[PDB]
């Protein structure tokens, strides 16, 4: 019987988690970029480490890291239903305990607050979308080629290309 604007703790959290991981992902590229250096999916096996052991399959490195990742991840689902994180930085974020205004249900637009400091992460929000939908682009453009820019005496024009196969 209750009309609108339900959502709550809800999935404001989901997006922001997308923004924060999108930003990190982009950093995972980032890397070559000035010394053109290394490229693309790479499928790397990541940084290395330096060799005595491997040849390297060496087991499933991910499967393991990821079992651990997995009870950090629960910790967060927990918090979100009923909350405890000492910093308390997504759920509201810091400046913490309030967000009371969300906690008892029903806000409808609300902007929000955070940190003992100030400048309300509305500036992290942006730096954060761009990185959302930046993967979007980045992932899209593979299918074809690695690299962007720098110079024209020839490069900018996009004089001849592949298409999609049909």
């Amino acid at each position: 019987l209750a009309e609108d604007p339900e959502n709550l703790r809800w999935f404001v959290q989901a997006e922001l988690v997308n923004g924060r991981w999108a930003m990190l992902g982009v950093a995972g590229m980032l890397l070559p970029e000035v010394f053109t250096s290394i490229g693309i999916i790479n499928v790397p096996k990541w940084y290395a480490a330096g060799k005595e052991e491997y040849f390297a399959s060496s087991s499933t490195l991910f499967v393991i890291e990821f079992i651990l990742s997995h009870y950090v991840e629960i910790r967060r689902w927990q918090d979100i239903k009923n909350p405890g994180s000492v910093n308390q930085d997504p759920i509201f974020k810091q400046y913490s305990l309030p967000a009371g205004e969300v906690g008892y249900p029903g806000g409808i637009f609300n902007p929000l607050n955070f940190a003992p400091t100030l400048e309300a992460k509305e500036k992290e929000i942006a730096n954060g979308r761009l990185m959302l939908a930046f993967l979007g682009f980045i992932i899209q453009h593979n299918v074809t080629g690695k690299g962007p820019f720098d110079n024209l005496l020839q490069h900018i024009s996009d004089p001849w290309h592949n298409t999609i196969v049909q």
Binding site: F55, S58, S59, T60, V63, I64
Partner: protein
């Protein structure tokens, strides 16, 4: 996840906590009879030398007159079941709360009677050690049930396999 948090009384509680679980507890040492054939491996550089009745090279004496059907396995077996079946019977029948008869007049008041005839009496630490046992037979023992021909002659470099299998 048999439990997250289901629930309510006398059977889950009653049959289920107390006893499934005391009967699982009777289990770990008894698991231990089994783990035990195994510990018997289990220390290196111990001096077994050589019996222990493994692999069927022929007779228990042989016996005078024939050996019974063929082998040990059935004798030990038939016999074990009737003896033990008798003991599962000794577990069977008290009650807790009090036991005078097939007595007719003890329902509950408030509060609040008798706890599972045995409830734990504390030294529910036995349980940390206990769950831990249920978990290990499960899982780990299984961790090598599956393709299990070989004893170690351990190589290098690391560990695990993944697919497979």
């Amino acid at each position: 996840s048999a439990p997250g948090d289901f629930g309510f009384d006398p059977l889950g509680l009653g049959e289920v906590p107390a006893n499934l679980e005391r009967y699982k507890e009777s289990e770990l040492i008894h698991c231990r009879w089994a783990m035990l054939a195994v510990p018997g491996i289990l220390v290196p550089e111990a001096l077994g030398y050589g019996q222990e009745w493994a692999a069927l090279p022929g007779g228990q004496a042989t016996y005078l007159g024939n050996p019974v059907p063929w082998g040990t396995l059935p004798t030990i077996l038939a016999i074990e079941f009737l003896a033990i079946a008798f003991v599962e019977h000794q577990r069977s029948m008290e009650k807790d709360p009090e036991k005078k008869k097939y007595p007719g007049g003890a329902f509950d008041p408030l509060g609040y009677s008798k706890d599972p005839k045995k409830l734990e009496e504390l030294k529910v630490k036995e349980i940390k050690n206990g769950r831990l046992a249920l978990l290990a037979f499960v899982g780990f023992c299984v961790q090598q049930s599956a393709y299990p021909g070989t004893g170690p002659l351990e190589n290098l470099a690391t560990h695990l396999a993944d697919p497979w299998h």
